[PDB]
Every structure is written in structure tokens, then in C-alpha cells.
């Protein structure tokens, strides 16, 4: 979640608090963070430290 | 009997960053599926590390130009997310939004020139303490830098070091604020051959560690 | 690190280049779901109210931050300040309907009413700029809205997305510049 | 001590759909059996779908004459649950309780001629997109359609497809609609052999995925 | 139940609330149920796909 | 129904020292590591142990001065927190904060002479029941008292006992307080030898025991 | 924990109720009290009680 805080439970049924969300087939549907892992971070070409 | 309580004084009151949650009043809505939809981004800086955008120099364009006469200072900034060069870039549209920072920032230069164009560059970072930037390659050594030439890979990239004494800082420039409190970068041009009028563009981007912290509504409303 | 810039490839170098430690970041503010996660004023107001998050300041964080994607999704919180009882509508429904007090009516208590309300419109998605030649038999459809809602009177309207979900990002501004370095600005000080 | 408790700014007021329920004062009355009480229903689509009924046509007949000029569209109307020819049929008079619907709505058609009244007919759904329905079952026989004959069979069944670029969609009509949103249904009478005067009478059901959503009171009251 | 959503449990007793069904003797008894599914889904005669 | 409450009169009200805490409005703030930071205490008396303070005499000096007259009572004083010569140390500093003590109070003596000069002190605690202390070191011997000559080691320590009827003591002195209610400290010089005008520095510093109780803000603000 | 006594656990997670202290490696830095627990209590010398 975000910005909620509340240690303890809901005291009305889920399917009243929020809507129910569907699916036809959350998942790791991350488009900019599998991005932005993917980016180069060595160094091209050959070093001499 | 019943559960005796007691309503506190100071208590109760709406807070608009609140971590509560209202009560319902219109149950089992079913939504149509979502499932796979493209494009999704769950944190700011996932962009803003993955889509660099540019900086602003001189008239409004997003690079530099070599110059041709003697003077090998290509531009000059303070290392602010406030900073006039940075003003049009995501970074600084996101960085607006909370009060302080830390972390890499990383910039691009990607060379624009013919195949016959050539030219090497310096950039550096000039940490606090000093009084202004200096206009020469050779002062500027002295300090964290990096030199590299043009050839078939037009882009380089270079981090933008977080040496400061506190931990953060602040996105923010006070008034009071004369010389940049976290320095400058300056992009010096070593020497070109036959590259005058082309073009170096330059763009910044989060570094891995880049971070930020205290969320803030500050634009006028 | 070189690279051939013109395949858009990501890089992203770091201080081990020259010598340094990358370190340890905590981005939790910066968490879309959380940050979209406050209440946000709506300026315009009048007795009959359409929900459209759209009417958000555009330099808001919450505003700004929206119109910063071009698809979103949640779910919402209101709080309205009224005369009378408020009633809510659902998206589709006829004008009409807000004066029945079947629909979802919450009857005045002070000092002002805070609900929660679910998604309601017909699509999968929402948006906040569309690209039509037409839509019809800066205008973008009337079914991207929450619902509606009225009152005697409507004094104050906030929002509050839930679950927020942003889709294809487009661009987010900062304040422009007009002096030479930077914007500098009063920050907070102790006298 | 006691438990201390904070009293919330904006909840506790009335909300005439809540999901909570009042204290009760009379408490213990058994009421008498009503085991086995017949005719009960739990879902309004079940009846809606059991119970088929009739769509309005011209002066206000529950059905379409057969045509004995060289006409071939027997009617035509909007597909939409607030159309005059569905006003009738107790399917909009469900639906108008409702923002949103999806799925299949089925039409019957019920040749009432005599054993010697001869006819081919032909429905079609034409889909928006056209600016007017076609007169021609030339024209229409490129759209989604069936075609049947008289016979042992009075009753004739056909689906009116859910196809729109919305998962639901709206029960009522705006006053800008100007062509119907989700387009028209066509009945032609391709030809007929001594079929004059005789009538198809024509009803409507919920189909197996029909569904209704967002409950709404907007009857002026 | 239709229309009711609270996680926890009542506070009053049953025969409170509401008022107590008696039987001589809810179940299965949904009349229109039982006839919507009973309805034709088929195609009478020959099929030529 | 819902759950009856009985919100209580006399309950509710904000009091400045109460065992609760307010509600949360902007959370996930992780702090900067301020992890083995130096010189952090946990308990005033921690310090108030480790580092004793001086005590004011005369004029306002940290010390007491060799008589060379055929006077031997070198000072004298109230065992009191509110006592003048304690006034600028450490110890009552914090003593004001609270209402009762006790406990043992240790006295620091440290001589300062040259290695030439020699002398032989005695400090006695004069427990209350007397009209007034004795300017003799043969009178005050009959109290608890202990003597030490100067040599190699300058610093000599002695606890003041708590001796009193109750269990506690009040930190501060009420105005019909005629004679100190817990007794005085008088400091002897026995003899010396050219010890003229040598010093002798005396500092305070809490004890094993020492306890301060029921915290207390009684400045003018 | 200092002035506070509710038996009851809090109803807000502690992520909201306080800010996170982070560490780079509380413990026994007390420099004050280790420095007051060694402080000399014997008596230096010989003894004739």
C-alpha cells in the first residue's frame, strides 16, 4: 500500500472498502523498473587502473 | 454496563496526508481487467534513472557548441537540481516535489559532429570552497575529472559525485544563498579539429543511489 | 563509459568509474502509489459537481504528478464541505438522478463528509490527454469521470486517489528560470 | 484509566446505502413458516431471462405486419435499452435502474400467419460506424445476420452481439447522441407468398452473459 | 446478505436484530432460477458449419 | 446495531506530561545514521557522578584559602542543593528540577600548594539538633569526621551521609527554614606549615546512592 | 522507552508513528556511564580499622 498506516485491520469487507479489481489471462508488469535494471553500467573498451 | 471512553482533546481532526481510510458507501464494483496494460512505472526514479532528458544552455538549446576561438570553457553550472540548466529536465520536474537529496546524478554528452569532426573534452566537478569555477582545463585537473575523445561511440557519461557535509541537501536555492552550495561542472573543450559549429548535447539522468526524500506541494496555487 | 547514444540504450554509470562507492537509497518517497496517496483540493466548484481529477491544479504535486502520465487507475476518497445533504452518482448516470435520495445521499453532519469511493467509469483505464479526431456522435470524454455529486451548496472538495496506478509517463516541468544560475528562493528558517 | 479514544472529523453521518445496521429495541418474534412459498426470485436477470417480452412497432403493436408493397425492411430501431420500441419490455424496465450493462440481448421473432402464409425473414445487427442503417438486405447480408423460413417452427431466437470499444456501456442515452452509440438492429422480409397481413411478433431476453452495474434512482420523484 | 459489509460480528444477540424464521416442514426453492436454467441453448435441427 | 460507548466526563483533557501519543500524518522518514555518536548520556546522575563541579566561596573563588591567623574554621555550610556555595555546581543544577532527594553527596578536596607547603585539614558533618556549628575542630571531633594530611596525592574524597528522619529531602529551602534543616559541613585547617595563602580547591560530585525524585519546573519564565 | 504507559500496542505502524533510525556498521554507548562506573570507590592505602 501507500500511505496508509493502520496496524490494525479493516473494519468493512473488501469488496466495500475498495473496487474489486479482474483479470482475463498485480504481476511483475514493471515496465520502467525492468528498464531501468536493464542499463549499462560497466565500461566499454579495456582499463588501466 | 457498557465500555466506558474517554474522546480526546486534539484528536480526530482531518489531516490531508492522513493514513486512514474513509468509509464505504457503494460496494461490490467489479472492474473491467487491466491485466498486462504497457508502460507501467511504480517509482519516479525507475524513469528518471532509465529516461534521460537535457539541459538547457545558452539561447534555450540542449547543447554545446565548439568554439572556435581561444576560450575552452564550454559551459559552466552549479550542481543544483534548481539550476537554470536543469530547469527543463525531469529530474528537476520531479525534484521540485521534495525538500532534499542525495545521491548520483549522471550526465551525457553525446557528440553530434561530422565523421571528419573531431574534438577531446573535460568535465569536472568543482566542489565548494573555491570562489568561482575556473575557465581552464589545467586548473580545473586539480580536481575530479574526466577527459574523452570523439569516435564511434558519440556518448559519454559521467557521475556527478554527493560530497557534502551533511547527509542531504536541500532541491531548493535560498535567497541568501550567493556562490552554489554544492559546487559547479564545468565542460571544458581540450582541442577539436575542423569541428567548429558542431553541436554536443548534453543530458542528465538518476544514478543508481540517487534518492529523495520529504515529499513537498511548494508551486503556486 | 562510451556508448553508441543513438540506440537510446540506457546507462547508467556510477563513482566506481574514478574511485568511489555507490551507497545505499531508501526511494519510498517517490513510491507512485504513496505519493499519489493525499488529498488534493479542487478549485472550481458549484452545487451540481462532476468528479474529474483533471479539475487538479496543474502545479499541485498531486496534479503535476498525474499529468506526468498519460494512463492511470484508482480508486477514490472525497471530502466535501456542504449545506445540505450530498448526494453521489455513479459514472453513467443522468443528471437527474442527484436530486433522489436512493443514490448514495450522506445526510449534513459537521463539519464536512469523508467518503470513499470506487472506480467507477467504463473503460479499463483512464486518461488525462486524448487524442481524438473527434470521441463524439483539449476535450476529453465526458465518461472520464468518478460520478457526480450535490448539494444546497458545495463549499470545499477534496480528492484522493487510492491505489494509484500511472502508465507511459510524458513530461513534468519545474519552474523556468529567468536568473543566470539558479531559482533561488526563501526556505524555511528559524527568526 | 480508560481507553482513550479519537473522534473522527467527517464519519458517522447518515449515508442512505450504508453497509452497517441499526440497534435493535423489539427483540424475539418468530415469525410464521414460509417454507416452500412459491414463484420466489433472487436475481432480476433470472426472471429477465425466463420471462421474454414485447418490443412496441408503430401505432403501439406488440409486432411487424409483412409488407405487401416492394418494401423489405420491416423495422429497425436503436440498440439501446432507453429505445421506444424496448420502452415495453420489462428488460429496460430493469435497466433503467442501472449506469452500465454488457452482454447479450436476445430477440425472438414468432410467426403468427396461417399453415398457408409463406415467409423468409432476415435480422441483422449493424454495428456504429455507418452514418445510416441500410435498407437492402443486399446491403445489410455484409453485416453479422440470419436469415429463417416459416415452418413447423413459429419461434425464431438470435443473439444481438456485445461489440463495442468499451467493456460496458451506458443504459442511457445523452441528448448529444445523435446516432445511436451502439448501433441498430435491422428486420427485413426478404419475400412472403400470401403472407399479406399476417404477423412476427417480436420480444427480447437477457442472454447468458448479460449484466447490469452501478445501481441508480433517477425517476423524478 | 445483500447490502451489508461489516467484518466484525454484531453486537446484539440474533433474536434481536432480526426477527426469527420458523419452518413446519432457505433452501433451493428459486423458482426462476430453476427456470432460467432450464432454458433451450441448443440449435434444433441439422448443422452444416 | 453497533458498539454502545460511554464517553466519560472528566476524561479527554490534553494534560502536558501524559502517557500517550499523538497521531501519525507524514510517515517513512528514515533518519541519517547516528550510529556511535560520542559522548551520549542516559542519566543526569550518570554525569553528575562523573564529573564533579566547584563550590563558590567568599568572594567567588572555587576555593578556600590557608588562614594565617589563630582562626581554624576554614568555611562552613548548609548540606542543601539550594545551599550559595552550591549554587553554581552542577548538581544543583540539576536539583532544581526536582522536589526531593537523597542519598550520599561526595566533597572533593584538592590542595594546590607548593611542594614546601604542608598542611593537615578536617572536614566534619554536623548533623542538625545544634543552634550553630562549631568553630572548633576539638567540638566538632564528636561528629562524624575524618582528617588527612598533604603529600604526594592532592585530591582527597568524602561522602556527606544521609541522616534525617524521612526517607527524602526536599531539594529546596522554604523561607521559615530558620537553622538548615539537614545540618552543615564545616572544613578545619589543623595546622600548616608556610602553607600561607596556599589554596585548596572544593568540588561536588553525586554519590552511589545519590537519588533525585518527582521532577519539578519551578523557574520564572 | 520514557513517559509512556499505554498497555495497549499502538494503532499506527511504526513507520508512521516515528521516523526509522538507520544504521551504517541503539547499543552500550554510554560514554557517561561507563565513565561513572569506573570511578575509583576503594581507599588508597594501608588500613587500620
Known sequence: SGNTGSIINNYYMQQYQNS?????????????????????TGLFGALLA | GIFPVACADGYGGLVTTDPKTADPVYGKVYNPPKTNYPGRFTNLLDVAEACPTFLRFDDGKPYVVTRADDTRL????????????????????????????????????????????????????????????????????????????????????????????????????????????????????????????????????????????LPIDPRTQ | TTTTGESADPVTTTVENYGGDTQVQRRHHTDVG???????????????????????????????????????????????????????????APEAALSNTSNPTAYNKAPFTRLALPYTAPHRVLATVYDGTNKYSTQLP????????????????LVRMKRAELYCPRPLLAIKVTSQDRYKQKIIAPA
Open chain 1, 20 to 40: 474489486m479489481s479482474t483479470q482475463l489471462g498485480t504481476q511483475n508488469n514493471d515496465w520502467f523498473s525492468k528498464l531501468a535494471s536493464s542499463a549499462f
Open chain 2, 74 to 213: 564550454l559551459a559552466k553550472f552549479d550542481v543544483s537540481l534548481a539550476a537554470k540548466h536543469m530547469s527543463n529536465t525531469y529530474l528537476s520536474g520531479i525534484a521540485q516535489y521534495y525538500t532534499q537529496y542525495s545521491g548520483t546524478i549522471n550526465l551525457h554528452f553525446m557528440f553530434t559532429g561530422s565523421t571528419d569532426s573531431k574534438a577531446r573534452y573535460m568535465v569536472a566537478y568543482i566542489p565548494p570552497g573555491v570562489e568561482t569555477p575556473p575557465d581552464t582545463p589545467e586548473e580545473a585537473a586539480h580536481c575530479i575529472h574526466a577527459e574523452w575523445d570523439t569516435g564511434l561511440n558519440s556518448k559519454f557519461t559521467f557521475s556527478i559525485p554527493y560530497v557534502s557535509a551533511a547527509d542531504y541537501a536541500y532541491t531548493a536555492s535560498d535567497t541568501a544563498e550567493t556562490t552554489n552550495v554544492q559546487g559547479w561542472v564545468c565542460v571544458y573543450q581540450i582541442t577539436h579539429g575542423k569541428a567548429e559549429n558542431d553541436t554536443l548535447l548534453v543530458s542528465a539522468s538518476a544514478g543508481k543511489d540517487f534518492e529523495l526524500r
Open chain 3, 34 to 92: 504513496f505519493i499519489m496517496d493525499r488529498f488534493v483540493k479542487i478549485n472550481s466548484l458549484s452545487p451540481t459537481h462532476v468528479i474529474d481529477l483533471m479539475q487538479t491544479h496543474k502545479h499541485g504535486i498531486v496534479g503535476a504528478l498525474l499529468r506526468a502520465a498519460t494512463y492511470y487507475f484508482s480508486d477514490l476518497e472525497i471530502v466535501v464541505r456542504h449545506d445540505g445533504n450530498l448526494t453521489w452518482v455513479p459514472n453513467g
Open chain 3, 142 to 157: 465526458a465518461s472520464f469521470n468518478y460520478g457526480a455529486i450535490q448539494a444546497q451548496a458545495i463549499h470545499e472538495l
